[PDB]
Design a protein around this ligand. Sequence first.
Ligand SMILES: Nc1ncnc2c1ncn2[C@@H]1O[C@H](COP(=O)(O)OP(=O)(O)O)[C@@H](O)[C@H]1O
Lengths: 30, 31, 117, 117, 374
Amino acid sequence: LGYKDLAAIPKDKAILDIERPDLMIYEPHF
Amino acid sequence: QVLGYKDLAAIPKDKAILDIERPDLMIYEPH
Amino acid sequence: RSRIKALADEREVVQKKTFTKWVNSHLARVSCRITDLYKDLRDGRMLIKLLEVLSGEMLPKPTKGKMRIHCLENVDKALQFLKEQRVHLENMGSHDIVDGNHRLVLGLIWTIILRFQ
Amino acid sequence: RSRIKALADEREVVQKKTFTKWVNSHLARVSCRITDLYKDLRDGRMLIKLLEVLSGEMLPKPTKGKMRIHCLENVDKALQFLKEQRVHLENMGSHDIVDGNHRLVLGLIWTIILRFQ
Amino acid sequence: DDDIAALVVDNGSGMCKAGFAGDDAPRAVFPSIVGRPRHQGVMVGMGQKDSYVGDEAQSKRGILTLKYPIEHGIVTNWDDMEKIWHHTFYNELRVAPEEHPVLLTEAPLNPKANREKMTQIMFETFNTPAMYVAIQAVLSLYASGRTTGIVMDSGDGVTHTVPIYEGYALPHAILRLDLAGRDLTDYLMKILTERGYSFTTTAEREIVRDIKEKLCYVALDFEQEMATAASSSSLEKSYELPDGQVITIGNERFRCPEALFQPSFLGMESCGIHETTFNSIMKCDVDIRKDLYANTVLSGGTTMYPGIADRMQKEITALAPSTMKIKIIAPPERKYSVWIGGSILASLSTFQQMWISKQEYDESGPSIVHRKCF
Ligand SMILES: Nc1ncnc2c1ncn2[C@@H]1O[C@H](COP(=O)(O)OP(=O)(O)O)[C@@H](O)[C@H]1O
C-alpha cells in the first residue's frame, strides 16, 4: 500500500495560516 | 527608456539658484 | 477540549481504520473478522492467529479460560513469540493490551506491520 | 523646515507616481495591481510576480506565511533572483524592504527599470 | 509529493514533546521518566515488563523507582534516552524514523560530547536521513515573531538568557544560571517538612511537583506578603493526597518560587534571574540596549507561576535607568514556545540546505555537528 497511505501525514500546515503564533489559546488556562 | 529618460526621472527644469540675489544671507532651517 | 489531544485523536481515528482494514485483509483467510480493534484484541486469540498466519509457523495453543489471568497468558505467549522473532518491542506489556490502551495497541500493530514485511 | 529634505520630498512625491504607473502596466497582464508602492511591496509576492512578468522565467514558490520571517523569505528569494541576473544592488536587504524604507525601495524599482529596459 | 514532513522532538529534563513540522501544536507530550519495579512479583502468568516509559510509569508510581535520563540539561544515562526515543517514534507518533528528518533542541552551554552522542545515536541506530540541533531560546524567538529581543528560558533543567539583535546573536552575553524547577521541588519538600508532612520516596516527588504546579504564585512584595500571611489565615489552601489525606499548604505557596529571585535560600551565592537578565542586557553594546529593554521575552514552563511577569518587570525597572521603556512579553502558551518556533524553522524553504546529510556524517564522522549547527 505504501508508507504515505498507511501513516496519516498531514498535507496541510496549520502554522502557516495563523498570523500571530504568539496569540494562541491552547486552553483557557484560568 | 520608456516615456523618455527626462520624463521618467524627474529632473528639475528650472534653476532656483539663479533667482536668488546673494547666497551669503541664506538660511536652510529658519529655527 | 485541548488542541494537542484533538490533533492526536484526529490522527488516531484514521490510523485505526487503516490498521483495521489491513488486519482484516490478512485475516480474511481464517473465518475471523474484527469489528473493533481495541475490543477484539483484549482476548488475545485473534492476535495469535494473525501472527501464525503472517509468519506461516506454528504457535503454542492458547490456554482455555474466561478469567483475566488466562487472557494475560494468551497475550504474553504472542508477545514472547514476537520477542524471539528478534523484533524489538519497547514499552510492551500484556496487561497494557488487556486494559486496552489505544496508543500501545496501535504501536504494537504498527511495529508488526513494519517488521513482518 | 529643512529645505534639503523639502526638495527631496518634492522629488519622490512625483517619483512614486511615475514608478507606480509604470509598474501597474506590467502587472496588469496578471490579475493584480498595487494601490501603494511601499505597503504592497512589503509582502514580497507582488515584486515576485513583477519579476515573473518581466523576466519570463519562473521563480521558486513563495511561502504561504503571514509572519515577518516569511516576508523576509519572500523578499530574499526575489533578491537572489535579481543577483542571479548580473544586477548590482548596494546595501539592499530584505529587512529594508520589509520595514518599508522609502529611498531604498525607490532605488530598487529604479534599478529594475534601468536594467530590464 | 516531495518535501516530506520532518518531525521535531523537544527534549528537556521535565517533559518530551514530539510533533510534525506543519502542525501548530505537538502531537505527543509526556514526561521523561523510566521506572523499574522494586518488589518481587508473585503471580505466575501476569506477564513481565522490564521497564516503564512515559505516562503509564506516572500511572504505576507505587511499584517503581522513578528516574530521569536528563539532569541539568546533560544526558546522564543513554540507554534510557534510547528507550525514550524509541517510545516516541514507534508508540506515540508511530512513524518510520528512517524516512523523515529530525529536529532537536538543546541548552546553549553544555558539554561538547552531548551533541556528538546525539548525532551518532540518531544516525547509527535510527538511520535517519538528516538531523539538526538548535538552541531552545533561539527557537523561542521564532515563536515570538520578532527578530530583536532577549530570551529568558527557564525549564526543568537549566535557566539561560540570550540576546539577539536584528537576527545577530551575541555569544559573549549568554548566561546560564543553574536554578530550575527540580531545585524548587526539592526546596518545596524541605519547607513542607516544617508543617509535619514528610515526602521522601521518588513517587511522592511527583505529588510535591503537582502541589507546586497547582498552589504556587510569585508575590509582588515578598516581605509584605510574609507580614500578611503571618497576620491572618486568608492565604491558605487545601490539597488532597491520592490516599485521601488533606494537607494545608498555607504560607509556603509564595516561598517556593521566591527562591528564583533570591538563590541564597538554596545556599547558592549566584544572583537572581532578574539580575541575570539585567547583566545579560548590560554585557551588550550601548546602541542595542534600548531595543533589548522593550523586547524581553519569557519562555519555559517554570515561568508560568502567576505574577512572575509583574515582579520581573518591577525588578528590571528598578535596575534599569528611569527614562526607558521596560515591558515583559509573556505568551499564554510559552511552555510550548520552544517547540512552536522550532516547527516554523522546519517550514522555511532555505532551511533545506542546512540539514546534516547522511553522506556528510559518513565523510566527517560525528564531529560535523560542531561545524554545521550554530
Ligand atoms: N502550570 C505550571 N505552573 C508552574 N510551574 C509549572 C507548571 N507546569 C509545569 N511547571 C514546572 O515546569 C517544569 C516543566 O518544564 P518544561 O517546560 O517541561 O521544561 P522542558 O520542556 O525543558 O523539560 C516542571 O518541573 C514544573 O515544575
